Structures are given as C-alpha cells and as structure tokens.
C-alpha cells in the first residue's frame, strides 16, 4: 500500500540528451527498448544508470546470455559515482540469474526487484529499476504452464500474459510514502524479439500498456553514432503532462524548441527521397539548405558520447541553448539565400563551427559561452 | 556475436581487428555486381567498382576455398591484404594508413 | 457387389459410377470419432484410407472373363485444393485423374476438362 | 477463385518474399547507373548548336 | 532531311543540302509527313519556335513510338536562344523524375 | 499426405540416408521426367566413387561432371533475376547459359520409360554426351566473343544434332558422337 | 447503417440526406486519380482531374481537422457546402438544384 498514487507530471531524465529532451518519460515512465544485445548497444543502459537523476540504482536482468551476464558483474565495480566520489557499486542492486537455473527462479525474477524497489522507495528515495531479457521473461511462464493443462493462446505464450505483465507496471510513479515523501519507480522494458520482429505477442502487448517507446538500432551504429536511437519510430505520450513542468522551470520557450526541431524529421524524411539518391546536380539552394541544417543537428545535437566529463552528462538548459542557436542559425539562413548569398560559404564560416564545440564545452562556462557565441551569428549574417 | 576480446595487439596483430571489418563490407559490396552485370556490361560500371568483381572471385576461389590445406592466422592474414591490393587505397579507409603501409 | 456378380457369372460390360463421395466420408467421420478413434489426419480418421481403399479397389478384369468392372468416381472437394483431404488420398489409392477447370468454366467451354494436372 | 494451398507453401512464399524483397533491393540501383550516366548528356546537348545556329 | 519554317529563313534550306517547304500556313506538317517517310532520307523536319512544339500527336498517331523525323524549335530571329537549355533541364525533369 | 515436405515422417527420414531425390509435380505434369529438382536433391556418395570412375571409364570424369553441375545450379542464379524483369536483360552470357542448360535438361535430364532404347543408358554413352555439351559451350564462348548472333547459334543445325543424342543407340554411338564433334567444329570454326 | 432515418424535413434540414452522397463519390474519385499518377505519368492523366485533385485537398487538410472546439450541425453544414463550390454545379448530379439555389 502507499495510499495516494498522485500523478506523474514530473520529469525523469538521464542526461542522455536525445533520449530525454525528445522523448521524456517521467517517474511513472515505462519505456522499452529493443535492438541487438550481446553485441555492443548495451552501453547506454549502463551509462544510463550511472548518471540518471535518481539516487538508487536497481538493476536486474534475467534470462540473459551467459557470458554477457558476466560482463555486467565485472565492469560494474569499475564505476565510482560522479555524485559522491565513492564507489558506484555501493548503491546498486543486482538480481540476476543465468538461464539454466531453476525454472521458477525466472518466474520470480521480476517480483523480486519489484518488491525491492518499494522498500527503498518508501524511505523517500527515487529508484531506478531496469529490466533486461524481459522478452525472455515469459519463457519460464510458458514452461510452467506447460506442465499443467494451460494450452496457450497466440503463438505459444500462455493465456496469462497480459496479466502478469500488467501488474509489473502498476507499481510506479508518484506514490506517497507512509513517510509522506515521494519515491520514483520507473522501469524500462528491454525486450527483444527473436529478430527485431513485431508480431511476437510480447512486444505488441507490452507496447500498449506502457507510455514511451525508445526504438534503438544497428543502422545508426554502423554509422558510428552511439547512442543510435532512431528517433522517427519512437514516442512518448508523456510529453503532454510534462509540458507544464517543462516550461515552468526550464524555459518558457522550451517546448517551442523541441516541437520546432521535430519538424526536421518530417521535412527531411520527405524531402530527401529521390533527390538524395541523385545528389547535388540539378537541385537548388534552399533544397540543399535543409540537409545542411540537418548536418549540424546531427553531428552535434544528435551526437553525444560516454567518454567525456564535459558531454556525457547534460542538463536541460544546456541542450536548450544549443538547439536554440541552431534555430537561430536557420532563421537568418533563409534570409541569406533570399538575398542570394552563397550557402556553401556560410557553412564554411568558423562561427558555425563555434556552435559545434558547445557540447564539449563544459556546463559552467556554458552560460557565457552561449551568450557570446550567439551574437556573433547576428553579425556574421549581415556580414554578407 | 562476441569475438572482440579475442584478438588484437598483445594477443595477435592489432590490425587484424579492423582488417576483418574491412573486407566484410568490401566483399559483399561486390558480390552482386555479379548479377547487375547481367543487365549491363562492364562498361556501365566503373573500373573502381569493377575491381570489386575480381575481388570476390579471388576471395572465393582462392581465399575461402582452402581445401585440406591447413593454415595459420598469419599465413592467412597476409593473403587477405594482398588480395585487397587489387583495389586502390582509400577504399580501405576503416584502417589507419600505417597499417596499409605495412602491407598492400 | 452387384458388380462382380454381373461381371463374373453373368458376364457384362458395366460402367459403375460413383458420385457424392465427398459426402461419404462426411458421414464416415461421424461414427469414426463420435464413437472414439483419434483422428488420423486433418479432421478425419485414419482408417479413412482403408475405407477408401476397399471401395475403389474392386475394379478390373480377371483372366478370361467377359465382365468388366469399371469404376468411375466423381466427386468434389471444396475450392480446388487437390490437397484437401478427400481427393488427396484418393489420388494415391486410385489411378486416373481428370480435372474440371474452374477457370475455363466461366469462359464458356464445355466440358471444361483439361490437363493442368490431369494425368491419366 | 482460390486461397492458397495450406502448408509448406509457407516456406515457398517466404522465398517469394526473398525473391521480391531482394529483387527489388537491387532493382533501383540497376537504374542508379543509367540515371547517373544521364546527366552528362543533359549538359552537353546545346553547346555548338546554339553557337553556330546563330552564326 | 527537309524542313519548313519562316519564309525568310526558309531560303537557306532551299539552297544546299536540303529541301525546304517553308510556309506559315500549315501548322500540322502532315502535308509532308506521309510523303517524306516514303524515302526516309529525311530524318528530320525541324520546326521552329514560331509554331508550337508538343502537339505532334498527328505524327504520334502514325509513328506509334517510331523514331521518325523529330523537331527541335529554332528562333527564326536570333537575339537569344539558350533559354530552352535552361528550360530543357526541366523538360525532362518536370514530367517524370523529380522536377525543378 | 500433404505432399508437403514438411510432414514429420518424411522429414525425419532425411537425417538417416546418404543420397536423396525430390519430385516436383508440375515438372511431371509437363513432359519432364524423371522429374527431380536439380536444385533440391543431393547426394553425398560420390565422394568415394571417384576411384572407380577415374580408372574404369575415364580419368577426367569427375572433372567434367562437376564442371557441369556448376551450371546446373548456377543457372538458377540468373533464373530468379529473369523472373522480375523478364528475359530481356540478356546479352551474351545471358542467353549463353539459359539456352545451354535448356537443352541440357531437354536431352540430358529427361528420358522415357517407354522408348525402347531411351530407357537404358550406359555410362560411356552418357560420358560422351557430357562432352558434347561442354564442347558446345566452349565454342559458344568464342562465337559470342567474336560477336556472332546467338539467334543463329540456335538455328545452327548442329544444335539439333546434339538434340537427338539420347535416341541414338550404343553401337553407333561412339562414331555418331565422334562425327558430331567434327560437325561441332565445322559449325563453329567455319564461322 | 442508419442515416436515411432521422434526416430530412422537420427533423433537420432537408438537404442533408442529399449532400451526403455527392461528396462521397467526389472525394472518392479524387484519391483514385492520385493512385494512377504514380504509374503512367502524373500529367499524362485527364486534365479534368486536376480540380478533383485539389478538391481532395480541401476536404483534406482544410476541413477534417478542427482541433478541440465545440461545433454545431449548423456551422458544420455551412462549411459542408463550402466544399462543393469549386467544382461546378453542373457536376453535382446527386442533388437537386433547389438547395443549390438555397446556397452557393
């Protein structure tokens, strides 16, 4: 019990820009991710938890492939929190099991963590559960039900499905403690069908209940661009209720940026098509211009990385300025080409590259670094 | 799926790693030049991509066919390189130049 | 049995015709399974084979006889799946195989029989 | 009128998809070449033509 | 080849190498079309901008995709004519394939 | 019972044999016999018959036969691509193969079980045949490289001569075939 | 199912029942065009299509959306008429002329 469950409307961030600025999820959030695992992409899930925005790390996978299951264990103690200076492992929870264990091991798996979360949660802490090999989770359930009478339904999974699945998610968000404080119980659904497929029950069931979906992919990774979250197929209903809190604290023009930037995808997707497969050769300036913009949004705004103490971690206000500048660079850009000026010149003004370095620019020098950087654009555009 | 820790400097040549992910995308890329060539002659295709016809052919014929011939990683690794020499450089460009300067 | 009888002691040239065999098995099934037997394939009992052996098998001629036991069955399975249970096994069992051709039918050619898998 | 058969055909029609899916994979870039070669000619055409026509 | 055109420029044809028939009456050219192809040494019949290019469809009803004499307009008074390059880019690109 | 090859009793059987054959039906609906899929059927046992062939008949026998199979399974290689744009993307090596294989199945992968002689075969007869075709293929490369119309290559009589071989009969066969190797070279070397 | 019920005079306006059906086929033959464009050639299709084309847009991004906001059968039907105008009256064959003279 927890009395009131109050309401979500309160962020949940992880400092991975594209993730949260584009698809915020909140503390009642329920996400999910797919994509090959046991190959490399996992980086994110880890780092996720490293920074977070929580204060209690709770993680469990179950049904994970053997060898991979050992990686976690081992690379885990090589982390020392960047919020206490003490070993990260201290405030971490590991429930895991291989796969070759007892059956009902797996059946409980979830329930374990789930329970545990509440505990700590009750003390006023915001927890961060994450589940992995979620897809496999049902497996055992299949087994058990095998040895009974339950014939399944669907492709094989038992008739309970959307059932035991259900309750697992109903333990999140803005519970009120019996201490009268709050504790966050967001979970993210790392599921993975046998091959990225989307007619396996599991996926098409889960998907429904939860509110945000974060498709990840190989393509982007082959491109060298980690995180490789493919934005166009991902979503978060969250956005709605988050809009108040967004603008309140962050910036009043804050939403206005994201929705503005999304227009990109819409107009890049549908701009490119044959044209991009017949390249520069009969096009026009304003045609190209779009994908020029894309370039910056995509080498900076999109790009980030996990190996620097000046760019893995982020804040609202950090990204916010960034994107703002990129809008501010477009806004004069159409006013340039309509004056008739070279495009491919603007794009060779180092003032624009000076936008480029901002991400690596650190948090503290950041306010001023934006301030100054910015007005240079203003004069660089009527420079021509 | 998991094979990264098993090679590299201090276990074997460092450059093998990336040699593997070179030849991969290189190979396949060519193998279906094989059939679009059945639509239009060599000419329509360039020389540079045309070489990727020949690449395949020696890759499959000599390299992959390996008969009973027992081998070793070095005796193998070289072969590869050598074979790539048939293409012009900068097409292996997932490799720093240093390494290419030690083979080719 | 009226065939052998006319064939052998009376000696004849009788054409014997079967039509509605589809419905044979229908009823067959009923006793089949309503009593018990595990179904022997695609909703039908397995001795179906036998039951459709025992019917068709009777034909032919014996040495030096002026009879003739000609079996000509005709039936219809749904759709045109020759793989729908009934004609299925019939095929193995039987011998001939002549087909109507649905397609030809509504393009006005009669009899629509053509070789498309009719294979004597 | 007919539906399909009922089994194995699954696999065959999967290799139908293989045929299609992969076929059409390449089917563009058959044409990529010809569209490629096309531009040069578009350029070239009127050059001498305009010059000495007027002369 | 043989052509038709403006009276004034038609002359040239009539001089050497060609057979003129220029007039500014016919705007259909059938008049020659059938007769012309009888030998087929006329591989062209230029038309000029001074007519109208596309509604060749008379010819299309005869040719049915056959590569018989094909027009290209001509100015008939130069003062420019390069626009149908800078246009011509479009003449392919607007109808199929992405336009400009 | 399906005729569907995924039914258990059948399939478990593969997993316990050394050589195998499959039969398509519309193959057989058409005149082809003894209709097996050239793609779809395999053996293992040949990887031990090689001695016997090698000595007994001839010593280049496994060589010429694998060199045949090369086509037989490679021909499909184009076939699919035919089937999504028609057979018209053809140029030389196209209708080279297409046709080659065509005849190969018309006379070298089809027999009667009723025509007197064409119902029994000896190795050595077959052995011959396998060289017929080879030859034709070889010379065809040099027709086409030279620039010759495959169109006429079809309507060379010598194609048709090869198109009668199985109806021939053993005794005559040596020389029949031997004459035709000349008739080959005459209907090639001439052009 | 129902609709030719509860419509007509004294219940609603009497042109409702009619102005249904017109629209139906109109919009219909719009998209229908848009299919075939992408096959033979866009501008190789009938010229008296281009209007029916544009007519599909109006009902499209002009009408359908209306955000959140109260609406009324009145205000509706008013703009329901709006739809028809651009296409001639001589092309509206499922409605009588009286209501056309009621509005346009």
UniProtKB/Swiss-Prot annotation, chain A:
Any one GO biological process: proton motive force-driven plasma membrane ATP synthesis
Keyword Nucleotide-binding appears in the UniProt entry: yes
Keyword ATP-binding found: yes
EC category: translocase
Alphabetically ordered keywords of this record: ATP synthesis, ATP-binding, Hydrogen ion transport, Ion transport, Nucleotide-binding, Translocase, Transport
E.C. designation(s): 7.1.2.2
Residues the record lists as binding ATP: 35-42
Annotated Gene Ontology cellular component terms: proton-transporting ATP synthase complex
Biological role: Produces ATP from ADP in the presence of a proton gradient across the membrane. The V-type alpha chain is a catalytic subunit.
Protein's name in the database: V-type ATP synthase alpha chain
Originating gene: atpA
Included stretch of the parent chain: 194 to 577 of 578
UniProtKB/Swiss-Prot annotation, chain C:
Function: Produces ATP from ADP in the presence of a proton gradient across the membrane. The V-type beta chain is a regulatory subunit.
Family: Belongs to the ATPase alpha/beta chains family.
Protein known as: V-type ATP synthase beta chain
Source species: Thermus thermophilus (strain ATCC 27634 / DSM 579 / HB8)
Organism phylogeny: Bacteria, Thermotogati, Deinococcota, Deinococci, Thermales
Whole sequence portion shown: 240 to 359 of 478
From Swiss-Prot, chain E:
Record field: transmembrane: none
InterPro entries in alphabetical order: ATPase_V1-cplx_f_g_su, ATPase_V1-cplx_fsu_bac/arc, ATPase_V1_fsu_sf
A molecular-function term among this protein's GO annotations: ATP binding
Keyword Amino-acid biosynthesis tagged: no
GO BP: any one term: proton motive force-driven plasma membrane ATP synthesis
Entry keyword set: ATP synthesis, Hydrogen ion transport, Ion transport, Transport
Role according to the record: Produces ATP from ADP in the presence of a proton gradient across the membrane.
Family indicated by similarity: Belongs to the V-ATPase F subunit family.
Protein name: V-type ATP synthase subunit F
Lineage, top ranks: Bacteria, Thermotogati, Deinococcota, Deinococci, Thermales
Curated annotation (Swiss-Prot), chain F:
UniProt record similarity statement: Belongs to the ATPase alpha/beta chains family.
General function of this protein: Produces ATP from ADP in the presence of a proton gradient across the membrane. The V-type alpha chain is a catalytic subunit.
Gene name in the database record: atpA
Disulfide bonds: none
Organism: Thermus thermophilus (strain ATCC 27634 / DSM 579 / HB8)
Whole-protein residues included: 387 to 577 of 578
Protein's name in the database: V-type ATP synthase alpha chain
């Amino acid at each position: 019990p927890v009395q009131r469950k109050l309401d979500p409307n309160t962020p949940f961030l992880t400092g991975m820009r594209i993730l949260d600025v584009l698809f915020p999820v909140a503390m009642g959030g329920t996400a999910a991710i797919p994509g090959p695992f046991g190959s490399g992409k996992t980086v994110t899930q880890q780092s996720l938890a490293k920074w977070s925005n929580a204060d209690v790390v709770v993680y469990v996978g179950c049904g994970e492939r053997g060898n991979e299951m050992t990686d976690v264990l081992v690379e885990f103690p090589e982390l020392t929190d960047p919020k206490t200076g003490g070993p990260l492992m201290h405030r971490t929870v590991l429930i895991a099991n291989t796969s070759n264990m007892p059956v009902a091991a797996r059946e409980a798996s979830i329930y374990v963590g789930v329970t545990i979360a509440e505990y700590f949660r009750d003390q006023g802490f915001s927890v961060a559960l994450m589940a992995d090999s979620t897809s496999r989770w049902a497996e055992a359930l299949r087994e058990i039900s095998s040895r009974l009478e339950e014939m399944p339904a669907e492709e094989g999974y038992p008739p309970y499905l959307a059932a035991r699945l259900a309750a697992f998610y109903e333990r999140a968000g803005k519970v009120i403690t019996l201490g009268g404080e709050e504790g966050a119980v967001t979970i993210v659904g790392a599921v993975s069908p046998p091959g990225g497929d989307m007619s396996e029950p599991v996926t098409q069931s889960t998907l429904r209940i939860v509110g945000a979906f974060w498709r990840l992919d190989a393509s982007l990774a082959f491109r060298r661009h980690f995180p490789a979250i493919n934005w166009n197929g991902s979503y978060s209903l969250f956005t709605s209720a988050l809009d108040p809190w967004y603008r309140e604290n962050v910036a009043e023009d804050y939403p206005e940026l994201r929705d503005a930037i999304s227009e990109l995808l819409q107009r890049e997707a549908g701009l490119q098509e044959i044209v991009q497969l017949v390249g520069p050769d009969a096009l026009q300036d304003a045609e190209r211009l779009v994908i020029e913009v894309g370039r910056i949004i995509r080498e900076d705004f999109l790009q980030q990385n996990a190996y620097h103490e000046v760019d893995a971690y982020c804040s609202m206000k950090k990204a916010y300025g960034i994107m703002k500048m990129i809008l501010a660079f477009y806004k004069e850009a159409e006013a340039a080409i309509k004056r008739g000026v070279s495009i491919d010149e603007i794009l060779q003004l180092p003032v624009l590259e000076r936008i480029g370095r901002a991400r690596y620019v650190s948090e503290e020098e950041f306010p001023a670094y934006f301030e100054e950087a910015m007005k240079e654009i203003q004069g660089a555009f009527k420079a021509l | 799926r998991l094979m990264n820790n098993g090679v590299g400097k201090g276990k074997t040549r460092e450059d093998h790693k990336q040699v593997s992910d070179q030849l991969y995308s290189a190979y396949a890329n060519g193998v279906d030049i094989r059939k679009l060539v059945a639509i239009i002659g060599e000419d329509a295709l360039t020389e540079n991509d045309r070489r990727y016809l020949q690449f395949a052919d020696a890759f499959e014929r000599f390299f992959i066919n390996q008969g009973q011939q027992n081998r070793s990683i070095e005796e193998s690794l070289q072969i590869a390189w050598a074979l790539l020499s048939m293409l012009p450089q900068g097409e292996l460009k997932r490799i720093s130049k240093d390494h290419i300067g030690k083979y080719y | 049995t009226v065939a052998e009888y006319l064939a052998f002691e009376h000696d004849y040239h009788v054409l014997v015709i079967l039509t509605d065999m589809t419905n044979y098995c229908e009823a067959l099934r009923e006793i089949g399974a309503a009593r018990e037997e595990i179904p022997g394939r695609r909703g039908y009992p397995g001795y179906m084979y036998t039951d459709l052996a025992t019917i068709y098998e009777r034909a032919g001629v014996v040495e030096g006889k002026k009879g003739s036991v000609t079996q000509i069955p005709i039936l219809s399975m749904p759709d045109d799946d020759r793989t729908h249970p009934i004609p299925d096994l019939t095929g193995y069992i039987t011998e001939g195989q002549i087909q109507l051709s649905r397609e030809l039918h509504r393009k006005g050619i009669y009899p629509p029989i053509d070789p498309l898998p009719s294979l004597s | 009128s007919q539906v399909s058969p009922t089994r194995m055909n699954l696999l065959q029609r999967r290799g139908q998809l293989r045929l299609a899916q992969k076929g059409v994979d390449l089917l563009k870039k058959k044409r990529d070449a010809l569209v490629a070669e096309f531009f040069g000619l578009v350029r070239e055409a009127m050059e001498a033509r305009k010059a000495l026509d007027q002369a | 080849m043989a052509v038709i055109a403006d009276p004034e420029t038609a002359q040239g044809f009539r001089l050497a190498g060609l057979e003129g028939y220029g007039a500014s009456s016919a705007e259909e050219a059938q008049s020659l079309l059938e007769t012309l192809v009888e030998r087929g040494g006329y591989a062209l019949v230029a038309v000029d901008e001074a007519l109208l290019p596309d509604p060749e469809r008379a010819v299309e009803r005869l040719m049915r995709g056959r590569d018989l004499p094909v027009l290209l307009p001509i100015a008939g008074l130069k003062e420019a004519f390069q626009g149908h390059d800078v246009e011509g880019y479009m003449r392919e690109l607007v109808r199929k394939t992405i336009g400009f």
